[PDB]
Design an enzyme around this catalytic site. Sequence first.
Site, PDB file in Angstrom:
ATOM      1  N   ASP A   1     -20.219 -67.210  66.062  1.00 29.09           N
ATOM      2  CA  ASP A   1     -21.338 -67.812  65.363  1.00 29.09           C
ATOM      3  C   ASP A   1     -21.246 -67.680  63.904  1.00 29.09           C
ATOM      4  O   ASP A   1     -20.508 -66.788  63.258  1.00 29.09           O
ATOM      5  CB  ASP A   1     -22.720 -66.310  65.151  1.00 29.09           C
TER       6      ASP A   1
ATOM      7  N   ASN B   1     -17.788 -64.068  70.414  1.00 34.50           N
ATOM      8  CA  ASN B   1     -19.108 -63.920  71.507  1.00 34.50           C
ATOM      9  C   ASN B   1     -17.695 -64.122  72.796  1.00 34.50           C
ATOM     10  O   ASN B   1     -16.173 -64.427  72.255  1.00 34.50           O
ATOM     11  CB  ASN B   1     -19.505 -65.025  71.997  1.00 34.50           C
TER      12      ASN B   1
ATOM     13  N   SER C   1     -17.035 -68.469  72.008  1.00 32.17           N
ATOM     14  CA  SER C   1     -17.571 -68.753  70.503  1.00 32.17           C
ATOM     15  C   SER C   1     -17.541 -68.236  69.455  1.00 32.17           C
ATOM     16  O   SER C   1     -16.957 -67.231  69.421  1.00 32.17           O
ATOM     17  CB  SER C   1     -19.407 -69.560  70.902  1.00 32.17           C
TER      18      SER C   1
ATOM     19  N   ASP D   1     -17.676 -65.810  75.147  1.00 36.57           N
ATOM     20  CA  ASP D   1     -16.569 -67.042  75.592  1.00 36.57           C
ATOM     21  C   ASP D   1     -16.743 -67.782  75.029  1.00 36.57           C
ATOM     22  O   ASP D   1     -15.131 -68.993  75.210  1.00 36.57           O
ATOM     23  CB  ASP D   1     -18.218 -67.530  76.111  1.00 36.57           C
TER      24      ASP D   1
ATOM     25  N   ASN E   1     -24.561 -70.950  66.738  1.00 34.66           N
ATOM     26  CA  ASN E   1     -23.209 -70.258  67.744  1.00 34.66           C
ATOM     27  C   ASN E   1     -22.147 -72.210  67.545  1.00 34.66           C
ATOM     28  O   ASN E   1     -22.791 -73.333  68.120  1.00 34.66           O
ATOM     29  CB  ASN E   1     -23.673 -70.136  69.171  1.00 34.66           C
TER      30      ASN E   1
ATOM     31  N   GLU F   1     -29.532 -60.956  61.772  1.00 36.41           N
ATOM     32  CA  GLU F   1     -28.219 -61.429  62.322  1.00 36.41           C
ATOM     33  C   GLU F   1     -26.982 -61.473  61.120  1.00 36.41           C
ATOM     34  O   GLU F   1     -25.877 -61.531  61.891  1.00 36.41           O
ATOM     35  CB  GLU F   1     -28.964 -63.205  62.535  1.00 36.41           C
TER      36      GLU F   1
END
Length: 129
Positions: free
Chosen positions: A52, A46, A50, A48, A59, A35
Amino acid sequence: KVFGRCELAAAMKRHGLDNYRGYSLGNWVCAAKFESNFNTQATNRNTDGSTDYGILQINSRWWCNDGRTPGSRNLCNIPCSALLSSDITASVNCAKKIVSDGNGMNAWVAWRNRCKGTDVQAWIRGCRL
Ligand SMILES: [Yb+3]
Ligand SMILES: [Yb+3]
């Protein structure tokens, strides 16, 4: 902070992740490697809108507040910036909520694709634990 493999495993064990909800310590170390490459300051945006955050790439749509993900929930009750700290406590505590939610560690795409069904114990091998 960029953790070493054994340093992170020891920190995770102290914070109660070994066998948490049935997931052995190697699962958590494997997930962190893929990750974030063990970097607490990792961020990724991301599609959309959002983002991380942190060593486990938690998220902002559901879990933390970053002030820029409209219609998001903050279920861990923390600013997303808290997930970037050299102290992994906030990340660990939020991860425990996530993994309890119903989908287990499948919530982490890297875990599903690169850790699940592999010899995850290899990630803590040689570590003084
Ligand atoms: Yb849900
Ligand atoms: Yb449901």
